[PDB]
Design a protein around this ligand. Structure first.
Ligand SMILES: Nc1ncnc2c1ncn2[C@@H]1O[C@H](COP(=O)(O)OP(=O)(O)O)[C@@H](O)[C@H]1O
Ligand SMILES: Nc1ncnc2c1ncn2[C@@H]1O[C@H](COP(=O)(O)OP(=O)(O)O)[C@@H](O)[C@H]1O
Ligand SMILES: Nc1ncnc2c1ncn2[C@@H]1O[C@H](COP(=O)(O)OP(=O)(O)O)[C@@H](O)[C@H]1O
Ligand SMILES: Nc1ncnc2c1ncn2[C@@H]1O[C@H](COP(=O)(O)OP(=O)(O)O)[C@@H](O)[C@H]1O
Ligand SMILES: Nc1ncnc2c1ncn2[C@@H]1O[C@H](COP(=O)(O)OP(=O)(O)O)[C@@H](O)[C@H]1O
Ligand SMILES: [Mg+2]
Ligand SMILES: [Mg+2]
Ligand SMILES: [Mg+2]
Ligand SMILES: [Mg+2]
Ligand SMILES: [Mg+2]
Ligand SMILES: [Mg+2]
Ligand SMILES: [Mg+2]
Ligand SMILES: [Mg+2]
Ligand SMILES: [Mg+2]
Ligand SMILES: [Mg+2]
Ligand SMILES: [Mg+2]
Ligand SMILES: [Mg+2]
Lengths: 316, 316, 316, 316, 316, 316
């Protein structure tokens, strides 16, 4: 079997980068819409007995892209592909990973079941919102970390990183922030927005010392940037000299760009798990860490039957 | 268990009509989008041990609506509903019902598998593009006919219906047209657009006599109205006095409204399996047959454990 | 893995032809009946890690043959075959492909489920009664066409084929007839037997002109030959000079042979998806198109991981 | 839900007896064959939300009957039956319950999988050839014993039963014979036909004393009656005064009737799990124990949610 | 259907409390070991059509208890129970909820799959180590919180609770601690043990102010009490006046009792999701919050088809 | 793919013997217990695309070992092993192979389902208590016989084996004893312990002649040795000169060692499907037949795609 890399409509630049790093051309696929807005998928080459990797991030037109991915997976399976792997850099519906409300769906589990029934044999993803999403499948799920790439960026772009403090913008980010602070041998802090019992002012509590130090906000994603912007205001109010925000998934939906442009961030750093070209044109603060080498190495090692553990300590 | 009727975002007027005919209020659901365009479903009441019917047509934002339906089905199942029925008046991806091309997906089968894995126990639909789609599920699938409603409209709105000829706009509609012509005891004709071997003019062949008679075009759907418009030009060129078009699914995507407005149709008749309010505002030729009573009777009989065979001979 | 071709009891001559065209000997199998008429299957060689193809048509003792096929598939799967493919030239129960009656089974779907649970990984079949039967499986299903072979026979055996008209014996055959007429660039006609509302005479309506022309009846199968015989009487009554019947599946059950012998057919042409040796001995009108090369090429390309699209335009 | 009893073509007299004992009429079903010998099943009434019991023994046209049963189960499931139970008095392919030969199928497991995929929720059967066949399903399987009925017949029809010896015709029947001998407080013996190493005379070894005593052969089934006839010759050669044969499944296929008529049996006693009317007309030695009351009580208790343990100690 | 409560060997006192609160006697079960240490389960009453709840905590002989639970679930399913619910107060293998190491199993997912294949229809559990474990099943999973009971204990047993600080013993507990601190309107702190890069001294970093205040350690479980004991030493070194530890799962395996007896805890508070009678006899610091009313109310509401949302705000 | 042999904690000496006979080192696995007695499995090497064989007998801590095996299978599957085979020399819960009691579980079927859901693709086992357990899986199950090894031991260690009688200790062993007696061309006898109707003395009935002959007791297993010890007393009381006991599974749980030491056995012969080192230290009568060559040959032939039928006639 040979590696066949197919791109959905979501992140074709990332698919191209992965294919170039693998020394391959992208597989021939036409991914369009019928007139009635139904997804049209036209695989333009044989995948018989091939090791098919379909790159599709959960971003942009989320349901459009997920349906595109499912249809492409099913087409490859029925076309007798040896193995179909869904390379999903940003897993859609990952934040709907539990039922903590009455009648609430576990949409991440539904997406996992849909991918399984479409015929996916393997999932490659980066920085799942909850790592337990790996357990939502009965197939192997590669949950790659952007943490080695983040540490590289911090050590190369922040002069006073050895005296910085890594700040969690919410309680759920504490593990990620503590891991990064341990790897950098720096202090960490946590910011919590307390629960909205009524319609008074949202107030943020900070635990840890950030006074007269550079604060680096690290989180898994910035959707509306309410979390990071509120954390940035709190950090400046607490005496932080400079505030950075580093995310792996830059969703930047809704008012995020205006929020960042009016915030105090020295830089907002995201990976290219989601296309950022449009976002960077309206926000100069955004910088992008390319993770295409990580995904390409993961795909290559999966095809060659080699461990991907190397990707959790080094940036290829 | 009690009937709980929940509406998706696709066709809420039809859901309201069904609920009124059942003497029920629609179940409390908030069906919106998160900022990143992920589907948000918030069922606002208990469905524990309830007989849940979710009405969602395949129309409008097709993938949005299908994801909404799947998430609502899964939420109801995890919320311990006694039974979850997907009422899908127009089945999405129904035209992708076979693999007659290399690497082509069977998207209808994928949609069926997705509905099954979401937890649907029963499907109620009207005039499947292919009746074999019933076989795409392992659960009961009700394929209701709009044919009794069509015959009623013909007998009440076309004065010379006894001398009319029912015309198939393509080869695939022949069974539907022959059934309607048999029930009306009238002649039938078939129109075929021959295959596009090169870039010459599309030419249509008509088999059957339509000269100096009213021609009624009957088809399962009109998406772009290319089929019915080309058939209408052919029918007028063949000497038909007046031309009607009767569909059960009025999709009317893309250039359909301009095509119909510039066509020669006496009337374009569709059911309300798809919302038509917007379409009727720009095309006076469109008339709507309400099928909400058929769907409501089907839901009521399904809940009561009664046969729906009555719906195939009478309009309630 | 190597190709292993195993024959059921249904069509062993076709299995032999396929094996010869593949340059192989048929796999050693004893397919008999126990005393109590239970199917006895004794695979006489190892199939470990082999690519097993089991040839069994739906014909003759239908349930006997289907049980034989299921038992052989399961034996091969438990015997650790790398892949088990059911080569079913005529799919049994294919006409029971929908539920258009109360309490009616979808027997084609049940057969598909039985084949899936027996362990079939791939289905190769010719001219499914409904192409949507491909969607009854979750495994790849090859629906080969006899159409290229039919066109070859028409062009080589009917002198006036360029002025002929291809006739559908019922409404359901319209797509097949229009496709053949398009490929031959000839006229087409359709014959419909209207529905039996009471016990009066069956009357047939013909749409299209067949007067003073050769009429070629093309259908997917002739079971009792009531359809083709009634169509032939109608065609002669309408002024057809000569009438041919071309089918892909010659079932010829019940009174079919006497019907054909007393009909006006110039020739009844069938493929050898079903054994015809016995039928030809009692009806001189029957001629057979060998499709063993099509099936052998399909098996060879499936084993080699090559597209079978070539089989839809050429006869190997 | 109400009990609906449907009969297949195999044993309709037993179905009638069960229905009468349940105070019910048999459900309306037409079970015939299409012209091409495909099974035709036409359920003539609604089974929506009903507790459906389908009676079909593995006998006669075995594959015909099993396909009939599977099609009826699937039709009832798709017709929205509350529960479908297969009442299979003699389980087909039960003797193919293991793989003790190369490439041998486990046909009993395949039949179980086929019943499961057809949609059976419950199996009721009598005296499985191997009780482990219960483990071939993931649904409850009732393995009823004819042993209480056998003991009743022995105590009422054999005057010297207290001095009799119960004889196993092969090694596999030892458990059944020891159980019966324990319940009767009588001696037991075992007869073994040693393995056929070459083409010499089949010789039988008897362990136990049968001299000058009545010998009762007890086995689960008599297919060709080779086992019981050879055992009977051995028992007479060993000095048995009279020889009885008691089976629960009288298959009597092939040469069994001539074998019994030429044997020395005082009586051959079978249950009516298989129809015996034809067999009794050609062999006066055959007597029938009616087990319809056992099956009817099992069905009634299954419907009422009551234990069937009472059936293992008493004959209702 | 009626509620049937069955106890495994793990926590029979809790099962008794649940049954008493439900006004029921525990179902008759013998749960012992065969001589070869295989689990022996003997359900002593009919569960036909019953709503069966099996109470079995993951504690004590973990694999013994889990096998007991699986065997009891399967026995109830095969015994035709209407519904089988596994009441697992402490979910076993819950800490193995992801693959963050090469070749690491997701044992929680395996346990979920085993429960699903045993036939569980519903899971009721308290304070899952990861709430995403709900997504490891395709059945409803009730993840009850001990948080209302913890808050009650704090408000009734700690006089200076309004000036206390709730302390997370690790980064993963941050969400739980922030939720509790929000509900109490008190400060929170977090303690992190940094990663063991080499064999130097384990050092703990504290973020937040605990000086001259009562510190309440809140975590989901205390297995070896290394986390809470190290956190307690850090808290005293940081100037905390008194230190409490509140857990929901008191596992107290290995050296935990000696660790607590030599620690500085004012009280170690656990729920009775795990039996604590033996632990309290050797450690006077341990106090137990009874959660049997929460579990009993959850079971009762599940049986009655009522929401369990009330249990997340009130202690019944 | 390469053979990877992994050992569980149950029988590591047998795993070592298998690996040596295969010319391999055992795969690196740490199989320990967490503090709370949960099974900890740490596979120490890549199994990507490997043919993994996990050796784990059902013995010792039965539930511990079975959970270990399931966790290791699941870890290998998620670690992308090409194929995972469970080598289970003594199948746990094999004696719970049917439901012959009210509410009784079929624990063997549950174990099979658990192995299937863990991801096992193949099972290799020796002398299943019931061969129908092969039918409890949908994957190939190799049921190897120790019979060739037993016959070798008898012919090499019992001087008067040609005049011996092979004795079944119960009715269920009759097939095994008759097969062995046929292969040795010797007499056989059967011993039955009649059913315990009340609390009187257990009495044993012997059928067959053992007077003044060596008696060889052959059974599938000796758990408590009650069966073989009672049979030995009966055989001596019946005039047997010497009594041997040959088993394939020596469980020797509970009072078995004291029973054997106080019995009259010339030798108790078992295979090493279960570790016997501890048992032999307290009972000099126990001798061990090494079957590691049989298991190693089975694994090697499974990997090489060769028949294992040779193992049923010869000891490698
Ligand atoms: N150091 C690590 N940190 C986090 N996750 C890891 C780590 N090592 C492995 N994983 C997880 O395990 C998966 C597979 O691990 P890998 O080392 O590539 O080999 P294997 O597939 O045999 O376990 C990765 O995709 C990742 O999800
Ligand atoms: N006359 C008919 N024409 C077409 N389809 C039919 C007809 N009668 C029944 N069906 C199909 O069968 C389904 C169920 O049939 P119904 O008569 O309601 O009872 P049952 O569910 O017991 O079969 C319908 O939803 C429809 O798909
Ligand atoms: N005494 C028995 N001997 C043999 N099989 C039995 C016996 N009792 C029960 N069974 C088996 O168990 C099945 C169901 O048992 P039953 O006592 O009716 O209640 P439950 O279904 O709750 O176990 C029966 O159909 C039969 O297969
Ligand atoms: N306030 C809440 N906090 C956390 N989990 C909750 C909450 N409300 C509901 N849940 C979760 O949802 C499950 C079921 O919710 P419930 O309100 O009882 O009704 P429903 O089952 O219809 O959703 C609970 O068992 C729990 O896991
Ligand atoms: N002589 C035999 N006696 C008993 N069981 C056998 C015998 N031959 C084969 N089997 C069974 O069949 C299985 C596989 O058989 P084998 O001859 O190795 O080839 P195949 O897997 O192709 O059937 C064995 O593992 C065993 O369970
Ligand atoms: Mg979250
Ligand atoms: Mg967050
Ligand atoms: Mg179509
Ligand atoms: Mg069309
Ligand atoms: Mg048809
Ligand atoms: Mg036809
Ligand atoms: Mg047998
Ligand atoms: Mg026998
Ligand atoms: Mg954790
Ligand atoms: Mg922790
Ligand atoms: Mg047994
Ligand atoms: Mg025994």
């Amino acid at each position: 079997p040979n590696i066949k890399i197919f791109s959905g409509s979501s992140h074709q630049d990332l698919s191209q980068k992965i294919a170039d790093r693998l020394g391959l051309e992208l597989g021939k696929v036409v991914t369009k819409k019928f007139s009635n807005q139904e997804t049209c998928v036209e695989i333009g080459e044989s995948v018989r007995g091939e090791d098919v990797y379909i790159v599709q991030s959960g971003c942009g037109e989320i349901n459009d892209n997920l349906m595109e991915l499912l249809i492409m997976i099913n087409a490859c399976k029925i076309a007798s592909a040896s193995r179909v792997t869904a390379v999903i850099p940003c897993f859609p519906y990952a934040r709907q990973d539990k039922k903590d409300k009455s009648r609430a769906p576990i949409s991440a589990k539904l997406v996992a079941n849909m991918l399984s029934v479409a015929g996916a044999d393997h999932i490659i993803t980066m920085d799942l919102h909850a790592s337990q999403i790996q357990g939502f499948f009965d197939i192997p799920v590669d949950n790659l970390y952007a943490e080695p790439a983040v540490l590289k960026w911090i050590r190369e772009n922040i002069s006073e990183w050895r005296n910085c403090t890594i700040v969690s913008p919410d309680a759920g980010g504490a593990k990620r922030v503590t891991s990064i602070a341990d790897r950098l041998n720096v202090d960490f802090a946590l910011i919590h927005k307390e629960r909205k019992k009524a319609n008074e002012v949202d107030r943020m509590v900070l635990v840890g010392d950030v006074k007269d130090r550079v604060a680096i906000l690290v989180d898994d994603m910035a959707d509306t940037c309410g979390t990071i912007c509120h954390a940035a205001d709190k950090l400046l109010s607490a005496g932080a000299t400079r505030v950075y925000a580093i995310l792996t998934h830059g969703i930047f939906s809704g008012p995020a760009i205006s929020r960042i442009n009016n915030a105090c961030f020295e830089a907002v750093v995201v990976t290219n798990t989601i296309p950022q070209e449009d976002k960077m044109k309206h926000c100069s603060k955004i910088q992008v860490i390319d993770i295409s080498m990580i995904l390409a190495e993961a795909i290559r090692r999966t095809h060659n039957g080699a461990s991907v553990s190397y990707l959790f300590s080094h940036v290829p």
